[PDB]
Design a protein around this ligand. Structure first.
Ligand SMILES: OC[C@H]1O[C@@H](O[C@H]2[C@H](O)[C@@H](O)[C@H](O)O[C@@H]2CO)[C@H](O)[C@@H](O)[C@@H]1O
Length: 300
């Protein structure tokens, strides 16, 4: 009864709070690209995550390029199945317009406005929904001030015409790491959060200090994607640094979604090759990364 208990989420003094104004922290899993690993995104696996792992949020990563939504828009229906499962299971769900190789969110901004108009018209009167309008803006030529903020100032109005106040997570520069610039030039919408993403393979002490700077400017931050691996999503599992970040996020009340729920042979993947796509995994069917993440959320 997560969503029944906490209900409508909002931002109050830079913190995520429930409908009675108490701080809440979401912890869950992100899918990998829905064009590649969509079989792991269904009501049964989401229910297993909710009951066995204790997740209270699920992120549907809908890549736009890389064979995603622009090339084949049928993947939007998998997003709709994830949202409906989340509503049926009473947990939160992030709709992620997963840009990456299409590094500037303006590339497919017309398509994004149509997509977000449709999703917000369909689900805008449910409190489960959290919109993530541009996963990871990246490149030297993509800045908060010139590219990202103006993109958000075109997409947010579309959402807000149908859904006045569900949370909107906006990506930041340099693969959603540059929360410092966003926090110094914040968006006007009161229920916006800035995305901050990390990989435990990277030494993170300055990155934690930068999140603290942003929080100190009153910006709300959602860690909408993080992994236990290096920044490529592979290259080993780094659990000592992962735990430091876990503890940091609990001290700051940061919500998070781990990357990712798939059986791909890469360190960040949560499942081993024989894991059933509908849930029920044994210990042997979780990777080193998946076992750690599951323990962190169960401990919560
Ligand atoms: O295997 C599917 C698809 O994955 C691509 O790599 C992913 C990586 O698995 C993920 O952890 C990371 O966040 O993003 C990259 C890039 O999308 C891989 O490059 C493709 O060749 C592959 O088909």
């Amino acid at each position: 009864s997560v969503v029944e208990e906490h209900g409508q989420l909002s931002i109050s003094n830079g913190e995520l709070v429930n409908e009675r104004g108490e701080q809440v922290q979401l912890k869950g899993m992100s899918s990998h690209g829905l064009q590649w690993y969509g079989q792991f995104v269904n009501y049964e696996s989401m229910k297993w995550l909710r009951d066995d792992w204790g997740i209270n949020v699920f992120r549907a990563a809908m890549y736009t390029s890389s064979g995603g939504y622009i090339d084949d828009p049928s993947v939007k229906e998998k997003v709709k199945e994830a949202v409906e499962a989340a509503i049926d299971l009473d947990i939160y769900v992030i709709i992620d317009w997963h840009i990456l190789s299409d590094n500037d969110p303006n590339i497919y901004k017309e398509e994004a406005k149509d997509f977000f108009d449709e999703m917000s018209e369909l689900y805008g009167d449910y409190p489960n929904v959290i919109y993530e309008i541009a996963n990871e803006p990246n490149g030297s030529d993509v800045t908060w001030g010139n590219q990202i903020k103006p993109y958000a100032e075109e997409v947010i109005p579309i959402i807000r015409n149908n859904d006045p106040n569900n949370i909107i997570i906006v990506g930041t520069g340099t693969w959603s790491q540059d929360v410092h610039h966003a926090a110094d030039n914040q968006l006007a919408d009161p229920n916006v959060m800035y995305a901050f993403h990390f990989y435990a393979g990277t030494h993170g002490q300055n990155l934690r200090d930068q999140v603290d700077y942003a929080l100190d400017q009153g910006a709300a931050i959602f860690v909408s994607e993080w992994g236990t691996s290096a920044a490529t999503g592979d290259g080993g599992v780094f659990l000592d640094e992962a735990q430091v970040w876990i503890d940091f996020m609990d001290e700051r009340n940061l919500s998070w979604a781990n990357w990712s729920l798939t059986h791909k042979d890469e360190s960040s993947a949560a499942l081993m090759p024989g894991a059933n796509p509908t849930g029920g995994w044994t210990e042997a069917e979780l990777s080193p990364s998946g076992t750690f993440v599951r323990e962190k959320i169960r401990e919560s």
